[PDB]
Amino acid sequence: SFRRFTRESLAAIEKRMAEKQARGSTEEAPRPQLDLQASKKLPDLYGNPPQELIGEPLEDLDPFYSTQKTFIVLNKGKTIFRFSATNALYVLSPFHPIRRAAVKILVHSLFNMLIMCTILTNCVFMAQHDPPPWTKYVEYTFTAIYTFESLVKILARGFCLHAFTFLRDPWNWLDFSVIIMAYTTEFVDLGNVSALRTFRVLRALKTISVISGLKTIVGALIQSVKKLADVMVLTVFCLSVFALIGLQLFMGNLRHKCVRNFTALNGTNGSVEADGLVWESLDLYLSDPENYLLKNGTSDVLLCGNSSDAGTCPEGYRCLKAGENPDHGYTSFDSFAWAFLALFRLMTQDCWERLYQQTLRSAGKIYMIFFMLVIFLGSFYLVNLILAVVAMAYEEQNQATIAETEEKEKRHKCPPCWNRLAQRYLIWECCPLWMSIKQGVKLVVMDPFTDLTITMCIVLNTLFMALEHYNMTSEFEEMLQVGNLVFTGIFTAEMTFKIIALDPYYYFQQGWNIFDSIIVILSLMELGLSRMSNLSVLRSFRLLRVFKLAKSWPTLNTLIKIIGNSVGALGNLTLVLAIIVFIFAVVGMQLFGKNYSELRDSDSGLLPRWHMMDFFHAFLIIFRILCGEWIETMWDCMEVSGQSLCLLVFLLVMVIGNLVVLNLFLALLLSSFSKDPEDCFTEGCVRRCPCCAVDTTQAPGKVWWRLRKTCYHIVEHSWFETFIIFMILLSSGALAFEDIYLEERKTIKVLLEYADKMFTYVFVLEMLLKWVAYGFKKYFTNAWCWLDFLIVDVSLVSLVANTLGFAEMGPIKSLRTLRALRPLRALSRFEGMRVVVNALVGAIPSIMNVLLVCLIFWLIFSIMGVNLFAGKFGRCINQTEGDLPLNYTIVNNKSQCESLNLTGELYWTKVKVNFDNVGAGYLALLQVATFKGWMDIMYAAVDSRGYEEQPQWEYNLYMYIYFVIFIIFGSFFTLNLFIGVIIDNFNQQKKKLGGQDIFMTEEQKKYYNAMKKLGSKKPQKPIPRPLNKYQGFIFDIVTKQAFDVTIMFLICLNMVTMMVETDDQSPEKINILAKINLLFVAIFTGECIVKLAALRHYYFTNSWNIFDFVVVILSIVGTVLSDIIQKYFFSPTLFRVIRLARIGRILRLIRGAKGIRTLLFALMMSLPALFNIGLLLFLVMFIYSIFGMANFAYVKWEAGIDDMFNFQTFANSMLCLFQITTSAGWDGLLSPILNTGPPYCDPTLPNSNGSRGDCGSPAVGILFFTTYIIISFLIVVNMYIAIILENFSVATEESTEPLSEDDFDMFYEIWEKFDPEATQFIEYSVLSDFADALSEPLRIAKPNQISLINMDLPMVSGDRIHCMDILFAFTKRVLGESGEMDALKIQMEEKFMAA
Ligand SMILES: CC(C)CCC[C@@H](C)[C@H]1CC[C@H]2[C@@H]3CC=C4C[C@@H](OC(=O)CCC(=O)O)CC[C@]4(C)[C@H]3CC[C@]12C
Ligand SMILES: CC(C)CCC[C@@H](C)[C@H]1CC[C@H]2[C@@H]3CC=C4C[C@@H](OC(=O)CCC(=O)O)CC[C@]4(C)[C@H]3CC[C@]12C
Ligand SMILES: CC(C)CCC[C@@H](C)[C@H]1CC[C@H]2[C@@H]3CC=C4C[C@@H](OC(=O)CCC(=O)O)CC[C@]4(C)[C@H]3CC[C@]12C
Ligand SMILES: CC(C)CCC[C@@H](C)[C@H]1CC[C@H]2[C@@H]3CC=C4C[C@@H](OC(=O)CCC(=O)O)CC[C@]4(C)[C@H]3CC[C@]12C
Ligand SMILES: CC(C)CCC[C@@H](C)[C@H]1CC[C@H]2[C@@H]3CC=C4C[C@@H](OC(=O)CCC(=O)O)CC[C@]4(C)[C@H]3CC[C@]12C
Ligand SMILES: CC(C)CCC[C@@H](C)[C@H]1CC[C@H]2[C@@H]3CC=C4C[C@@H](OC(=O)CCC(=O)O)CC[C@]4(C)[C@H]3CC[C@]12C
Ligand SMILES: *[C@@H]1O[C@H](CO)[C@@H](O[C@@H]2O[C@H](CO)[C@@H](O)[C@H](O)[C@H]2NC(C)=O)[C@H](O)[C@H]1NC(C)=O
Ligand SMILES: *[C@@H]1O[C@H](CO)[C@@H](O)[C@H](O)[C@H]1NC(C)=O
Ligand SMILES: *[C@@H]1O[C@H](CO)[C@@H](O)[C@H](O)[C@H]1NC(C)=O
Ligand SMILES: *[C@@H]1O[C@H](CO)[C@@H](O)[C@H](O)[C@H]1NC(C)=O
């Protein structure tokens, strides 16, 4: 262009721009105008940097759409900066140094750094809660910078004058407000209301000024909620309907509790007597807290139930409805808002076992079914809908992003330059003197022989460090030191030899030699610091050598790639998430700081845990709520700082954090992706005995053939199969009567043992019959038969032990409990579970491959924890007071309080789950990674002190970092890898079989395909006209939208009528509610009667006309007739369900929805795939429950085991199994069955059965719980995958070819033109000149018409061309094979053919 601007340069366009409206003007395509936006390099025209053209305005070489008067300035980085040049009043001019200077500062990047040097410093000064008095001065300094920035920007573009001003960018005006207060509070009397100074922590958003990557990623994040639509509508609808159901059932059922026994007035007025003390009235008697009872082992209140299956409390107590609600009164069902909150808590899967147990105890066990109905509809499907929608949105965005560049692309490194001469002294390190040593070292260091050897020396070391535990003697330390020294020596020898073998110049090639160098030097320098002092965690980083297997293991490379992609390639989302967490923590602390000082009030300095008085605790609470535990802290709030603030803040942070984490997870996963039967057997050992092919003419030859034919005929009958299935079902079901009450029932044991004998009899006979039927092919080549063989063998050895009378040997009794595998025979009879078990068994190797690396990555942390927390958990306690540690002032170590054990009331004890060895470490890590029971482990860890020393309250605070790091690493990337592997394997299996799904059989295939068909339209008018007047003035209103609008208004009014319900009120509410309900029922009945003669009997179609009838009118008249009895009202439990059917009137609005219909269609699509999974899960639950019934029958009642939740009978065991199947709390069940001490168990107990003791053995319980958890996780993953696959597969419309009626118009016109008979003929010699001008372009060109001479055309008469066959071929081109519209045309031609 030019070196500098001239005054007359812009005149040529200024004299013409203003006349565009009249002279300039007298196909628009609004486009980005060939890219060329700000903050980009964009080398496209020249591609060569200028010499000294930096920091000057340019002539705006750009399309006129974005030129006007603006100009572009570039920096040394060629950053495009646009500035519109217009008059700014005063004496200012676009060509004046006061603007040249501002532009030159704005374009330059230096002051950019300045900004980044300021705000981060602010982020430190803002994190203090007790600032020093002198920091005020520093505050001014900060302001004295920020305003500067704003000033320069104004000087470049203007304030708000013409265009492209400082206030046109959305990100700009945010800083404006930051300036306001920066000059306001200094010179104004502050308002009466304080705590407004928390606005300052919004300038952290200014961090989005670091780079454009933050801006584009924020735009990407915000460009997903618009796609995410109507899914929240469906979620709100489901939550509302479930809350409405829940209100009608458990209303006022959370106040039940039992009080001590009453006594009559005993004369006088208003005087209730009890144990010699008199109370004034009933209100003041039922409200005193002393008159209640506490559940044993906990500081809570017991609840009663009047039903036969709701529990009770001991004698001397009667249960009534009085008092306040449990948990400070924030959980209840009295009103709609609390019910909504409880249902939302149930959706999130927060601590819901508490509410589960409370509701079950108060109302009854039979109500558990209700919970079974919510989880399946609230815990999985809505979450999966959200997941699938966001995944589709992200995939579409990435597809568009890559397609943009795909379309677009089609259409020095030596700063010092002084070390090169040093290379003249390098490389040639062999020196002029010759040596044969180098050749020898090069030869001996050869990969396929020595390298494997070194690998061995790495594995054993990993085991050698694994030998760390409690209570060793000096020998173990000696061996550990010797082994460590030997391994370090061998490593240093390898290094020294390798560097001599391969020249130092080539040594640093891939960086793994660098890794070896740093690990060797670190190990040596750690070995050097081994004296009396300087002892620390000497593992340091020598555990890193475990990763050196990366060469030999092609699986850990994927984990390394994922970890690497977590930084750099996708390194901006982590920054955004960190910024969000930081700002949320700071705002929470600022808001809720000075409201926790009143919560101690005891023990002279006992501060409750999880507070917000400091930055660290706020960060911990933010991390915890991100993990998925928020209700407990919300309860701690809302009683010290208000109720309408914590709710909003917590909901906002939860939503934002979950969205960000989920998007990061998806992005990382996608990046990581980037007739004789066979006689005996084959021709094997037959060379020794060809004794089968013998004379078949005599009896010895014919008998075997006849018998085998007979057996083949016998096994083929269906009656035999049904008999066997019935026997299997009965045998499986007969094991439910083995509870603790079997001894009392004298007349059931004999029947049970007779059945036990008969089952084995029939099974052995059946097995032998099949054994003689087929041959030796089965039981040895078929997979299914081996299981039956093994079970029959177990039963056979059991029966031979029983019959011989030697069943009192001992370990023989162990096989008796192994009968719980009997129900497993039903895994091959129904088609059913066969497909799902096949799919599950076809994926084992991938699971093993992932499991190996998982165990290694947890073993490293187990070793670290074993070192760091060895023997720091013991404490001695006073038995009478309970299980609380005393103090450090009196008792300090074990010796002191073992010397104080004079009267026999001090007991030393250690936590159930600890870190005393590697196995306990594995158990603790499994407990932590599932977020169940981690609180006790964390509390013990923080409470730690010296070796076997008594704990000190919060002595080692900074040990939360280890657990935070573990949760970040081991619970996120391993999950990503597992999900990716499973998805890859499942998709590969899907591609292998073909275009057919896996979890479906033939019958379900037929149903799926048949009901998939869509498209059925029939808007006929079968409306008679007895008199056009009377019906003609109403049917017009019927057709208009006014009718349906009034209908939805009536539905909404009914919804708001059912809105208002609470506990007992005055009758004036009840009467009004009943009157409104009656009016709405009346209007609905009238509405349904308006049908009358409007549609006659022609309305019985697929439309929603039977649904509303049968759901609304029959149910409402039934309920109202049940209510008008007016004689008596017994069994209110049998009364609420009657009016529960009124909720069916709220489900009619779906008919007029938009996407809810499609999502319900997805439900209907998916159900068959979930049926089989449910069947398999139920079978697994049954077998595990019957197995567990026989081991934990007489365990002590403590912690998570109560009288209503135990293993003493079938129903309670099933309830516990349902509770645990979602990993909803199993520490409380594992703890009681783990203890084995005389302080907590009595080995001598008068058990009703021939057994001793009161507690079991953990060695079986640990396996019992672990295997069940693993199996449940694996099955739930399969359900998840099937649901999402179906949901994102049904998102398609395509075309079903429904338009075929308007096809014969052209043919009718042609016939009317030439011959109206539909049987005419044509000739190509005339066609080539006749078929030239045709409208409705459904025809072909003239050359293409000639090719139709021998294209599906019979030859009749003198080589004439049949028109009807041409019509059939033409209609067959699109869909002429089956239909309802073209079928009439084909039938018309066929009928014309007849005559
Ligand atoms: C830039 C964003 C993404 C992260 C910002 C977080 C850190 C840069 C901040 C948060 C808390 C800050 C700490 C808060 C408190 C202290 C103690 C302070 O000195 C004291 O010990 C003061 C004692 C007292 O509190 O009275 C020195 C700074 C330091 C370490 C701060 C250093 C900077 C920290 C780690
Ligand atoms: C205390 C008060 C004054 C705070 C007010 C803040 C909002 C007015 C700001 C803060 C963040 C801004 C958003 C940050 C990022 C973007 C992306 C940006 O995307 C684009 O430029 C793409 C084109 C388009 O979205 O139309 C559009 C503006 C928007 C939504 C901004 C709109 C204005 C927002 C909401
Ligand atoms: C980063 C920011 C934007 C997060 C959101 C903060 C505000 C929405 C919060 C911070 C302080 C809050 C206020 C703190 C104290 C009170 C007093 C409280 O009751 C009174 O004492 C009312 C007295 C009156 O109205 O005169 C009513 C809510 C209110 C105004 C709060 C309203 C909500 C506020 C402004
Ligand atoms: C905290 C300490 C004790 C352990 C972790 C230290 C890491 C921050 C450093 C140490 C060694 C570094 C590695 C040393 C050498 C290289 C080779 C280097 O290779 C290249 O530059 C070329 C890559 C290619 O071949 O394509 C890539 C980075 C990498 C793996 C480095 C990645 C970062 C590492 C692991
Ligand atoms: C490693 C990540 C996960 C920490 C996340 C929070 C950090 C940004 C902040 C929160 C509180 C900060 C601590 C607050 C006070 C101290 C005390 C003081 O250190 C000590 O007295 C020695 C103990 C140590 O440095 O670990 C200075 C650093 C430290 C640990 C700070 C280090 C940085 C911490 C952990
Ligand atoms: C890198 C991988 C392989 C493991 C990561 C583990 C870290 C999260 C651990 C290892 C060493 C730990 C540190 C080891 C020692 C200390 C000193 C400790 O200080 C006290 O106990 C002070 C109390 C007092 O003596 O008065 C506080 C925890 C801290 C910083 C630990 C914080 C957590 C660390 C960094
Ligand atoms: C352990 O608990 C017992 C029971 O509370 C404490 O004994 C109390 O004090 C003396 C003995 O110290 C007894 O005579 C009293 O009967 C007990 N109760 C009360 C209310 O005083 C005992 O002191 C506790 N501590 C130790 C170390 O034994
Ligand atoms: C109940 O007794 C009180 C106190 O003696 C008395 O004032 C009151 O009138 C009595 N109420 C009756 C008798 O209804
Ligand atoms: C503690 O309460 C439980 C609850 O069932 C009861 O069984 C037990 O007997 C109580 N303990 C004592 C010592 O009475
Ligand atoms: C306590 O009251 C209940 C109420 O049903 C009664 O059954 C029981 O006998 C009473 N017990 C005593 C000791 O008064």
φ/ψ region of 907 (left if φ > 0, alpha if ψ in -120 to 50, else beta) reads beta
Nearest CA to 1268 among 1222, 1204, 1208, 1235?
A: 1222
Rounded-to-5 percentages of helix, strand, coil across the chain = 55, 5, 40
| CA distances for 1148 relative to 242, 1052, 1152, 1169, angstroms | 16, 11, 8, 28
Whether the Cβ atoms of residue 9 and residue 57 lie closer than 8 Å to each other: no
Please give the backbone phi and psi of residue 1175, each rounded to the nearest 5 degrees, phi first.
Answer: -60, -45
Whose CA is closest to atom 7 on ligand 8?
269
Residues ≥6 apart with Cβ < 8 Å to 446:
none
Residues in contact with ligand 4 by the CB-under-6-Å rule are 510-511, 514-515, 518, 541
What is the resolution of the experimental data for this entry, in Å? 3.6
- Ligand 7: residue of 875, 876, 877, 878 to mutate (most ligand atoms within 8 A of CB) is 878
Whether the Cβ atoms of residue 547 and residue 871 lie closer than 8 Å to each other: no
Whether the Cβ atoms of residue 1229 and residue 1216 lie closer than 8 Å to each other: yes
Residues ≥6 apart with Cβ < 8 Å to 1318:
1307, 1311, 1363, 1364, 1388, 1389, 1392
Whether the Cβ atoms of residue 1318 and residue 1384 lie closer than 8 Å to each other: no
Nearest CA to 951 among 864, 885, 881, 880?
A: 885
Enter the DSSP assignment of 278: E
Q: Counting atoms of ligand 2 from 1, which one is nearest the CA of 219? A: 17
Whose CA is closest to atom 5 on ligand 9?
1203
3-class SS at 1330? Answer: helix
Whether the Cβ atoms of residue 1254 and residue 1266 lie closer than 8 Å to each other: no
For 83, the enclosing helix (H) or strand (E) is: strand 81-84
Q: How far is the CA of 642 from the centre of ligand 3 (A)?
A: 11
| CATH of 1154-1296 among 1.10.287, 1.20.1070, 3.40.30, 2.30.240 | 1.10.287
| CA distances for 95 relative to 4, 89, 402, angstroms | 11, 13, 43
Please name the residue that has the structure tokens 């059989």.
1001
Whether the Cβ atoms of residue 929 and residue 963 lie closer than 8 Å to each other: no
Tokens of 821: 């595998």
Type of residue numbered 567: V
Tokens of 1299: 């338009």
Whether the Cβ atoms of residue 103 and residue 83 lie closer than 8 Å to each other: yes
Whether the Cβ atoms of residue 177 and residue 555 lie closer than 8 Å to each other: no
For 992, the enclosing helix (H) or strand (E) is: helix 973-993
CATH 1.10.287.70 given to domain 571-595+607-673: yes
Q: Structural domain boundaries of the chain?
A: 11-199, 225-254+329-399, 255-265+272-324, 434-547, 571-595+607-673, 698-828, 830-874+910-998, 875-902, 1040-1057+1066-1152, 1154-1296, 1305-1394
CA 125/CA 142 separation, integer angstroms: 11
Type of residue numbered 724: I
In degrees, to the nearest 5, what angle opens at C-alpha 560 toward C-alphas 554 and 561?
95
3-class SS at 1001? Answer: coil
| CA distances for 855 relative to 376, 840, 971, angstroms | 32, 22, 13
- Among all bound ligands, the one having the nearest atom to the CA of 568 is 4
CA 336/CA 719 separation, integer angstroms: 56
| CATH of 830-874+910-998 among 3.90.1150.10, 1.10.600.10, 3.65.10.10, 1.10.287.70 | 1.10.287.70
Check if 225-254+329-399 and 830-874+910-998 are the same fold: yes
CA 1260/CA 1245 separation, integer angstroms: 22
Nearest CA to 589 among 556, 622, 558?
A: 622
Q: Other C-beta atoms within 10 Å of 1166: how many?
A: 21
Helices and strands per DSSP (H, E), number in the chain = 51, 11
CA 923/CA 1266 separation, integer angstroms: 10
Per residue, the 3-state secondary structure of 113-128, as one string, reads HHHHHHHHHHHHHCCC
CA 149/CA 110 separation, integer angstroms: 13
Q: Counting atoms of ligand 7 from 1, which one is nearest the CA of 905? A: 28
Residues in contact with ligand 3 by the CB-under-6-Å rule are 195, 198-199, 202, 587
Whether the Cβ atoms of residue 251 and residue 1063 lie closer than 8 Å to each other: yes
For 979, the enclosing helix (H) or strand (E) is: helix 973-993
Q: How far is the CA of 1179 from the centre of ligand 5 (A)?
A: 51
Q: Counting atoms of ligand 5 from 1, which one is nearest the CA of 964? A: 3
Burial 164-173 (b: 16+ CB within 10 A, else e): bbbeeeeeee
Pairing of strands 317-321, 1360-1362: unpaired
Whether the Cβ atoms of residue 960 and residue 624 lie closer than 8 Å to each other: no
Please name the residue that has the structure tokens 């083995």.
738
Whose CA is closest to atom 6 on ligand 5?
616
CA 1364/CA 1370 separation, integer angstroms: 10
Q: How far is CA 650 from the centre of its chain?
A: 20
Nearest CA to 610 among 939, 346, 913?
A: 939
Q: How far is CA 239 from the centre of its chain?
A: 19
CA 1345/CA 1340 separation, integer angstroms: 6
Burial 938-948 (b: 16+ CB within 10 A, else e): eebbbbbbeeb
269 Cβ closer than 6 Å to some ligand 8 atom? yes
Whether the Cβ atoms of residue 135 and residue 164 lie closer than 8 Å to each other: no
Q: How far is the CA of 682 from the centre of ligand 6 (A)?
A: 68
Nearest CA to 835 among 987, 991, 996?
A: 996
Cβ-in-10-Å burial (0-12, 13-18, 19+) of 743 comes to exposed
Q: Answer positive or negative: Cα dihedral of 181, 185, 187, 190.
A: positive
CA dihedral 42, 48, 52, 57 (to 10 degrees): -40
CA 116/CA 817 separation, integer angstroms: 71
Beta-carbon-side half-sphere exposure of residue 45 (alpha carbons within 13 Å): 6
φ/ψ region of 1355 (left if φ > 0, alpha if ψ in -120 to 50, else beta) reads beta
CA 572/CA 957 separation, integer angstroms: 31
Q: How far is the CA of 1249 from the centre of ligand 9 (A)?
A: 22
Enter the DSSP assignment of 190: P
277 Cβ closer than 6 Å to some ligand 5 atom? no
Q: Other C-beta atoms within 10 Å of 647: how many?
A: 14
- Ligand 9: residue of 296, 312, 317 to mutate (most ligand atoms within 8 A of CB) is 296
Residues ≥6 apart with Cβ < 8 Å to 922:
858, 862
Whose CA is closest to atom 4 on ligand 4?
541
Nearest CA to 1272 among 1227, 1226, 1229?
A: 1226
Q: Which CATH class is domain 1305-1394?
A: mainly alpha
Q: How far is the CA of 112 from the centre of ligand 10 (A)?
A: 83
Q: Largest Cα–Cα distance in the chain?
A: 130
Residues ≥6 apart with Cβ < 8 Å to 1351:
1369
Whether the Cβ atoms of residue 1121 and residue 347 lie closer than 8 Å to each other: no
964 Cβ closer than 6 Å to some ligand 5 atom? yes
Q: How far is the CA of 171 from the centre of ligand 2 (A)?
A: 6
Residues ≥6 apart with Cβ < 8 Å to 826:
725, 728, 729, 732, 1179
Residues in contact with ligand 2 by the CB-under-6-Å rule are 170, 174, 177, 218-219, 222
CA 624/CA 630 separation, integer angstroms: 7
Nearest CA to 1024 among 927, 1093, 946, 1119?
A: 1093
Q: Counting atoms of ligand 7 from 1, which one is nearest the CA of 878? A: 1
CATH 1.10.3470 given to domain 225-254+329-399: no
CA 863/CA 1229 separation, integer angstroms: 27
CA 719/CA 725 separation, integer angstroms: 10
Q: Other C-beta atoms within 10 Å of 716: how many?
A: 10
3-class SS at 1271? Answer: helix
3-class SS at 263? Answer: coil
| CATH of 1040-1057+1066-1152 among 1.10.260.30, 3.40.640.10, 1.20.120.350, 3.40.50.10420 | 1.20.120.350
Please give the backbone phi and psi of residue 70, each rounded to the nearest 5 degrees, phi first.
Answer: -75, 160
CATH number of 434-547: 1.20.120.350
CA 494/CA 1080 separation, integer angstroms: 90
CA dihedral 322, 328, 330, 334 (to 10 degrees): 0
Residues ≥6 apart with Cβ < 8 Å to 1392:
1317, 1318, 1319, 1364
Sequence-ordered alpha helix ranges (H) in 167-266: 173-184, 212-222, 231-247
Type of residue numbered 180: I
Q: How far is CA 1367 from the centre of its chain?
A: 56
Experimental method: cryo-EM
Whether the Cβ atoms of residue 832 and residue 1178 lie closer than 8 Å to each other: no
Residues ≥6 apart with Cβ < 8 Å to 451:
none
Tokens of 1317: 């008979």
φ/ψ region of 1323 (left if φ > 0, alpha if ψ in -120 to 50, else beta) reads beta
CA 851/CA 849 separation, integer angstroms: 5
Q: Residue length, the chain? A: 1395
Q: How far is the CA of 193 from the centre of ligand 3 (A)?
A: 8
DSSP characters for 865-897? HHHHTSS---EEEETTT-S-B--SSS--BHHHH
CA 896/CA 888 separation, integer angstroms: 11
Tokens of 230: 């109507």
Whether the Cβ atoms of residue 1092 and residue 1038 lie closer than 8 Å to each other: no
Beta-carbon-side half-sphere exposure of residue 1322 (alpha carbons within 13 Å): 23
Type of residue numbered 827: L
Q: Counting atoms of ligand 6 from 1, which one is nearest the CA of 544? A: 3
Residues in contact with ligand 10 by the CB-under-6-Å rule are 261, 316, 318
Whose CA is closest to atom 34 on ligand 1?
124
DSSP characters for 579-620? HHHHHHHHHHHHHHGGGSTTS--STTT-PPSS--SSHHHHHH
| CA distances for 1033 relative to 158, 1047, 1093, 1099, 1389, angstroms | 66, 19, 14, 21, 45
CATH number of 698-828: 1.20.120.350
CA 571/CA 566 separation, integer angstroms: 6
Please give the backbone phi and psi of residue 566, each rounded to the nearest 5 degrees, phi first.
Answer: -65, -15
Q: Other C-beta atoms within 10 Å of 827: how many?
A: 15
3-class SS at 1391? Answer: helix
Cβ-in-10-Å burial (0-12, 13-18, 19+) of 411 comes to exposed
